[PDB]
Ligand binder design. Structure first.
Ligand SMILES: [Cl-]
Ligand SMILES: [Cl-]
Ligand SMILES: [Cl-]
Length: 129
């Protein structure tokens, strides 16, 4: 599924991301835009042979099992393919574990480089929430 901006903001709010570990909703919408272009089916392979999955580009080295990343962890206890679903539940639940890990949203490269320090409220402007 390719979400619209305000449709994803509403889905993220329903799933408890607004202000989760102090990150306002616009931070999560910005991260999703730049990680996946709001596409739940996005995948990208990394140099190390791990792969990033779904709307928040969660990595198989640590967070999910894809059967092809040797010596990796599965800290979210899920197949990586669950992160591709039109239902964002699994991605959100995993994202909550990641953001609690000690580096906050800095775990997401695109957030650090493209959202951090910007007017992230723009991402939710106009939306009925
Ligand atoms: Cl915000
Ligand atoms: Cl893994
Ligand atoms: Cl933090």
């Amino acid at each position: 599924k390719v979400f619209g901006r305000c449709e994803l903001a509403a889905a993220m709010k329903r799933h408890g991301l607004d202000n989760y570990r102090g990150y306002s909703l616009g931070n999560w919408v910005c991260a999703a835009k730049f990680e996946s272009n709001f596409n739940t089916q996005a995948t990208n392979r990394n140099t190390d042979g791990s792969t990033d999955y779904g709307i928040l580009q969660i990595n198989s080295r640590w967070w999910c099992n894809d059967g092809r990343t040797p010596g990796s962890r599965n800290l979210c206890n899920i197949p990586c393919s669950a992160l591709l679903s039109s239902d964002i539940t699994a991605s959100v639940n995993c994202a909550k574990k990641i953001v609690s890990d000690g580096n906050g949203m800095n775990a997401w490269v695109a957030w650090r480089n493209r959202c951090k320090g910007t007017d992230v409220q723009a991402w939710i402007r106009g939306c009925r929430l």
